[PDB]
């Protein structure tokens, strides 16, 4: 789909920007009833650990963290907060660092359109969920980065 | 390969169409692992600066801008947007004008078929990338033009 300020070497995504540049990566295919979950492993939290993991609609901005703009939702590692439309997060989970993994998926049942029940996980354990007024099958896995040294591994085949 | 509504004098390509005619140029050879990058220098943005630079499959339409139709991808100078299959662009980079140069290449590593990691540059600096579900070695350098006065220089031997 597309990415800016992020180097992609296989399943490894590394921040690659200068002074205040936000890096964003959007997967090619949306989640489905079958492949309804993905995980991101933090290899290095970098200077600020500002890694964001979530779902975004098609055509989402490539220079803004997922969750910051409308119809998108994400779990941010640096504060453990859930972002879903604005740059003000909501207390959600605990902060994540190098070694932790963040997961995001859609409840199979919601794949009956008219609503998407999205859940997040930290190291395989569910943190919390949210239901979006938007329809599923139109949500794409996305990762955001914002500081030097940040690096993760994308696992589109994650289970549990 | 072929071109319409574009005059070719050596490495110089100049728009040459009347009222609303789209000019398109497709190079003879596809990019390779070795020669995996090319640049286009804008000599004159013309009336609308609607110059497009990218990769297209063989047999691509000679009267549509690269990026507008399926399995093609391009960076459009007039809006800095990335087009990859439809006539609706996606925020990508900054607009380009007379004096700027646009580059496009494929990551050497992707030349292992089954996927093409395409990157774009503006004045030698990377703007962003996208991975296409299509295979490489089947992607041809292409330039599109659409307004009077538009002129560029094709640099198939560009490096960096």
UniProtKB/Swiss-Prot annotation, chains A, B:
> What parts of the sequence cross the membrane?
none
Record-annotated B30.2/SPRY domain positions = 3-160
Domain of life assignment: Eukaryota
Under what name is this protein listed?
SPRY domain-containing protein 3
Measured against the full-length protein, the chain present covers 46 to 203 of 442
């Amino acid at each position: 789909s597309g990415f800016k300020h992020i180097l992609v070497d296989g399943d490894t995504l590394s921040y690659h920007g200068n002074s205040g540049e936000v890096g964003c990566y959007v997967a090619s295919r949306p989640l489905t009833k079958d492949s309804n979950y993905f995980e991101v492993s933090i290899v290095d939290s970098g200077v600020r650990g500002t890694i964001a993991v979530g779902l975004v609609p098609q055509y989402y901005s490539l220079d803004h963290q997922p969750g910051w703009l409308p119809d998108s939702v994400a779990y941010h590692a640096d504060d453990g907060k859930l972002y879903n439309g604005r740059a003000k997060g909501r207390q959600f989970g605990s902060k994540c660092n190098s070694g932790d993994r963040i997961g995001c998926g859609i409840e199979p049942v919601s794949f009956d359109v008219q609503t998407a029940q999205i859940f997040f996980t930290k190291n395989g354990k569910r943190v919390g969920s949210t239901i979006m007024p938007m329809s599923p099958d139109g949500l794409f896995p996305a990762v955001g980065m914002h500081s030097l040294g940040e690096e993760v591994r994308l696992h589109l085949n994650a289970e549990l």
